[PDB]
Amino acid sequence: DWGYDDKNGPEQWSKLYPIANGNNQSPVDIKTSETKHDTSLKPISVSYNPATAKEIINVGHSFHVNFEDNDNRSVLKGGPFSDSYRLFQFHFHWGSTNEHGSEHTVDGVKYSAELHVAHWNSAKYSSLAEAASKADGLAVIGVLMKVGEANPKLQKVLDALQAIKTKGKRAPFTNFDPSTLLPSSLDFWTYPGSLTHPPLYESVTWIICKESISVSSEQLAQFRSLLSNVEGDNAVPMQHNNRPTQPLKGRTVRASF
Ligand SMILES: CC(=O)N1CCN(C(=O)c2ccc(S(N)(=O)=O)cc2)C[C@@H]1Cc1ccccc1
Ligand SMILES: [Zn+2]
C-alpha cells in the first residue's frame, strides 16, 4: 500500500513503484528563466458539458469528481496537442498548512493547493485504462491555488463533501462544468511528466496555468476535514496529499506566453 504518511509516503514510493525515480516524474519546479517560449503552441480550448458530471468519491487520500467519458461531450483541444482529449475527473491536492500544498512550484514558490483536471487521449485509445500507461495517453491541467479570498466557484464541490466524509463513500455529482474553476487567462507552461502518485506512470502531458485561482483558509480547512479512515473507525483527517517536486532530468518546460 501507499499514502502520504511517514511509512507509506512519497519518499517510500520507489520501494513498491520503482518508476518513482524515473526520468519524467511530476510534479516539478518551473524555473521561469529556464522555460522555452514555443510559438507553435496553440491556445488551450476546453469545452465541457455539465451533463457529463457523474459522481464524487472519497478515495482515502483525496476525493475525486468523476465524469461520464463514453463520448466527446467534454473535451480539451489545442495547446501542444493535435488529438482531442476527453475529460474524466478533477481533484485537488493540499498541504498540512497554508504555507505549502500545491504540487508544482513556480520559481521555488509553494502555493496552498492545486486543482488537477484530467483527460485521456480518446483519438488514439479506446478507454482510460488503455491510455493511462501510454506516453501520449493523459493530459492534466494544473491550476495553482493561492490562499486569499473565498472562491465561490468552489461552492458546489465543497457543499458535496459532507456526503462523502469517510473512505469509500460516494454520491451523485451532476450538472457541473469544471471549466468554471479555471482562471480567466489560459496562458500556460507544458512539460512531459507523470501521474503524481502511484502508479506514477509517465503518461501525462502537463498544462500548468500561469494565473492562479483563489481559495480561502476556511475552504482549505474543509478539504483537510475529510477523513481517510472508513466509517466507524477512529477519525483520521486527510491533512495533506501533495508530492514534493522531482528532478527535470533534462526535460524542457515550454511556455505559451
Ligand atoms: C487505478 C489507477 O491506477 N488509477 C485510477 C485513479 N487515478 C486517477 O484518477 C488520477 C490520479 C492522479 C492524477 S494526477 N495527480 O497526476 O493529476 C490524475 C489521475 C490514478 C490511476 C489512473 C489510471 C486509470 C486507469 C488505469 C491505470 C491508471
Ligand atoms: Zn493530482
Asked if 104 is an active-site residue, the reply is no
DSSP string, 238-252: ----PPPP---TT--
Ligand nearest to the CA of 26: 1
**What cell does 74 get?**
467534454
Q: Which of 155, 114, 147 is nearest to 214 (CA)?
A: 147
d(CA 66, ligand 2 centre) in Å: 13
Which secondary structure element, helix H or strand E, spans residue 170, and what is its range?
Answer: strand 170-172
Q: How far apart are CA 104 and CA 206, in angstroms?
A: 10
**What cell does 72 get?**
466527446
Q: Give per-residue burial for 103-141: e unless 16+ CB within 10 Å, then b.
A: bbbbeeebbbbbbbbbbbbbeebeebeebbeeebbbbbb
Q: How far apart are CA 197 and CA 140, in angstroms?
A: 13
First-residue to last-residue Cα distance in the chain: 41
Closest residue by CA, ligand 1 atom 10: 195
CB 50 within 8 A of CB 87: no
Indicate which residue of 37, 61, 104, 119 is catalytic.
61
Q: Give per-residue burial for 49-58: e unless 16+ CB within 10 Å, then b.
A: beebbbbbbb
CB-defined site of ligand 1, < 6 Å: 89, 116, 118, 128-129, 132, 140, 195-197, 199, 204
Question: Phi and psi for 120 in degrees, rounded to 5?
Answer: -135, 155
116 labelled as ligand-binding?
A: yes
DSSP string, 110-153: --SEEEEEEEEETTT-SSHHHHTTSTTSEEEEEEEEEESS--GG
CB 61 within 8 A of CB 4: yes
d(CA 33, ligand 1 centre) in Å: 31
Domains by residue range for the chain, with CATH: 1-257 (3.10.200.10)
91 labelled as ligand-binding?
A: yes
Helices marked H in the chain: 13-16, 128-131, 155-160, 217-224
100 labelled as ligand-binding?
A: no
CB 143 within 8 A of CB 181: yes
Q: Name the DSSP class of 237.
A: B
| Experimental structure resolution, Å | 1.5
Percent helix, strand and coil across the chain, each to the nearest 5: 20, 30, 55
